[PDB]
Amino acid sequence: QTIQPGTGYNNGYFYSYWNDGHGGVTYTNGPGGQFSVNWSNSGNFVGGKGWQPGTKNKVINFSGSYNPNGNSYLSVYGWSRNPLIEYYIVENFGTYNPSTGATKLGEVTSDGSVYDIYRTQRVNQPSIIGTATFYQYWSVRRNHRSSGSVNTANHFNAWAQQGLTLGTMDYQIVAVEGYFSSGSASITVS
């Protein structure tokens, strides 16, 4: 019932599950848009369900439970190509706000909360095209939650307004990410 890292389709949804090989993570696809993650003294991992490709105006619905113990995120997460960008619309997190130390590039209101916007840079890091230097875009929700709706156009438009351009979309998922933590989560996407 559980899987090792990979990508594919499961009950009509794209999934991606990646880990750094440290151990301590269990990823399980469920019926429809559902997936779960249970982790205990993990390394870095990212898993969840959605679409390949994403779109720039999707309304993404999610529902469930998210119980990190340590550094983890719950986000709409994905990539663009040309330019290569890794992006996040962060609905909830654990012990670390991923924007800590990052330069704030604005605010956007969407789906019941203000979000703060940031750009960061990854230097010679793994990516969907190989080792690369690339930007990351962040919207960080002020009011944390583990169910709701995300109107991705509000974010992508706000990012563009601020000079944060997206290329052609690659995948787009609701993802549970961890970085050397423990936790459990069970999320249904639509």
UniProtKB/Swiss-Prot annotation:
Q: What is its main location?
A: secreted
In this protein, which residues make up the domain named GH11?
1-189
For this protein, what reaction is catalysed? Endohydrolysis of (1->4)-beta-D-xylosidic linkages in xylans
What biological-process terms (Gene Ontology) are attached?
Answer: xylan catabolic process
Which InterPro entries does this one have?
A: ConA-like_dom_sf, GH11/12, GH11_AS_1, GH11_AS_2, GH11_dom, Glyco_hydro_11
Concerning SUPFAM superfamilies, the annotation shows:
Concanavalin A-like lectins/glucanases
Q: Which one Pfam family would you cite for this protein?
A: Glyco_hydro_11
Induction field: Induced by D-xylose, dependent on the cellulase and xylanase regulator xyr1. Repressed by glucose through negative regulation by the crabon catabolite repressor cre1.
This protein's name: Endo-1,4-beta-xylanase 2
Organism, by scientific name, is Hypocrea jecorina (strain ATCC 56765 / BCRC 32924 / NRRL 11460 / Rut C-30)
